[PDB]
Design a protein around this ligand. Sequence first.
Ligand SMILES: [Zn+2]
Ligand SMILES: [Zn+2]
Ligand SMILES: [Zn+2]
Ligand SMILES: [Zn+2]
Length: 353
Amino acid sequence: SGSGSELAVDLYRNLAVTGKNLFFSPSSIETALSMTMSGARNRTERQMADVMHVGPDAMERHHAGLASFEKQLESIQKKGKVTIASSNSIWPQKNYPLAPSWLAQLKRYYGTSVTPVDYIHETEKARIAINRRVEKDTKNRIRELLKPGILDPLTRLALVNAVYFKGDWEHPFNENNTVASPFYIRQGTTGKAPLMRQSASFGYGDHDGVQVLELPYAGKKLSMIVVLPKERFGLEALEKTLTPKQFALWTANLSERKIEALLPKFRTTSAFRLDETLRHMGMTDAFDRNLADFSGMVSNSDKLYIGAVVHKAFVDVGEKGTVPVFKADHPFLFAIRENSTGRILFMGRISDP
Ligand SMILES: [Zn+2]
Ligand SMILES: [Zn+2]
Ligand SMILES: [Zn+2]
Ligand SMILES: [Zn+2]
């Protein structure tokens, strides 16, 4: 229940691996797929629409909603209390005439820069061109995103997106309260993480098998949602049951309450070639040269198909900012949510900080 939340949960369940951290942006993936879907036709388009849960007649509404979300993100970055270093771009093969209607559709709903590159003859300089745009967009935070081997002379279309995030809390942790503590990874394996501690008014929900804690970032326009299994190693069973409605229930029961919160500080990164994942989720024609219908992209019978989808996300969680116990010292799920729309900017899991 909520825009983009169904794709976010689907993505989460396809990307979470046991014993392994996770951090990704469902909204940036969705934006990249939606920019591409606007040029898809016939069965290619319907598969992508099904994957993103866009009902029929609802396509334009879907793009507009992502456009207005992007404007809300820009408005939040301007307050200076969070960092969202983002890059989201699409890279067609050079010298394929592109349809004006697609580019118009791209400018009115995304305002993105499409710079074609010659994969056939200049694969390596295409790799360098793509890596340099990402470095420029992310203020040098995401460097040499594409390694040699992703692109080849048979690539015709690449979706590249990356995001760096960190934010100031509304309620800062005092560093003098942070203590390196055991972090239980699995039954017989215990690690170490610095546990930040404070007692403050947080969004809080009690449920059958989890506690849920909402920690707002400064300004209260974004919030971190931490879903903490009550059983020490209960995350996996919880992820198995995870549905969009369940996640909506966890985020709809968040009234303010003073909570003694213990949250590890951590940095974590995920980098994904998402092609196979997206095939599993039902987006198959788009990656098949013999089947993809991207005729909405071209004006002169050229054949585009998705050859690579690359996503990298980085998060930094620390103390900086300005009763029940919530002690996140065992594997948990978390998400960063935009509070005006409810949209999920990031999801992740911490199994081994
Ligand atoms: Zn679904
Ligand atoms: Zn569904
Ligand atoms: Zn508060
Ligand atoms: Zn597979």
